[PDB]
Amino acid sequence: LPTYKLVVVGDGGVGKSALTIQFFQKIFVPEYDPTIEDSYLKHTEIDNQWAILDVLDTAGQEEFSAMREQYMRTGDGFLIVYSVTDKASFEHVDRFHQLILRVKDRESFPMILVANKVDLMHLRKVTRDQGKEMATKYNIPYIETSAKDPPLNVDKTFHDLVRVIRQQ
Numbered sequence: 001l002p003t004y005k006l007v008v009v010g011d012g013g014v015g016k017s018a019l020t021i022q023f024f025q026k027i028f029v030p031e032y033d034p035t036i037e038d039s040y041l042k043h044t045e046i047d048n049q050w051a052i053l054d055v056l057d058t059a060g061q062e063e064f065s066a067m068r069e070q071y072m073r074t075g076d077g078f079l080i081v082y083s084v085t086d087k088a089s090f091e092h093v094d095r096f097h098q099l100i101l102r103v104k105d106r107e108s109f110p111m112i113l114v115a116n117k118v119d120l121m122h123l124r125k126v127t128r129d130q131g132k133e134m135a136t137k138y139n140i141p142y143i144e145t146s147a148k149d150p151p152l153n154v155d156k157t158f159h160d161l162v163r164v165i166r167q168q
């Protein structure tokens with residue numbers, strides 16, 4: 001019974017924990033801020049095939065973390081998340097991409113570029129074409145999400161990484 005180790009990375013504040021908790025626990029809690037990384041594990045059915053999804057919500061803190069390096073090293077696919085209301089997080093997407101391809105020592109590896117917080121329409125600084133242009137440049141899928149209820153593409157984001165892994 002296959003296990004897909006997934007890693008969520010991206011700048012501080014982009015929604016990594018929000019997206020993750022929305023996926024597993026089906027909730028949005030504005031006040032929830034975990035300082036340290038959490039992992040999560042659930043059976044899940046993607047296109048009629050069950051899998052265990054084993055997901056790390058990375059915490060981007062400066063200190064060394066044993067768990068985090070394990071997941072980075074053994075991970076099957078990454079979600080690279082930025083926030084559409086934080087232009088810096090989008091500029092810093094290159095850091096993450098580059099980081100993932102070194103740890104893995106590969107030319108490509110299963111990733112999705114995740115443009116989050118698209119409910120905050122009046123604060124949107126990164127446009128849809130900008131994000132798609134950048135997806136294209138790395139040749140990886142682009143998806144827009146919102147962890148907030150009712151969420152958008154949160155389930156699809158996770159299943160789509162699995163899909164990417166599977167059909168690779």
Ligand SMILES: Nc1nc2c(ncn2[C@@H]2O[C@H](COP(=O)(O)OP(=O)(O)NP(=O)(O)O)[C@@H](O)[C@H]2O)c(=O)[nH]1
Pocket residue numbers: 010011012013014015016017018019029030031032033034058059060116117118119120145146147148
């Ligand atoms: N409206 C809206 N708020 C969101 C969305 N995703 C996250 N937020 C909010 O934005 C803030 C930062 O969320 P958080 O999930 O902790 O970000 P993070 O990526 O885990 N940052 P860190 O690296 O510090 O853990 C929180 O207030 C959270 O409620 C979203 O899609 N829409």
Ligand SMILES: [Mg+2]
Pocket residue numbers: 016017018033034057058059
């Ligand atoms: Mg977090």
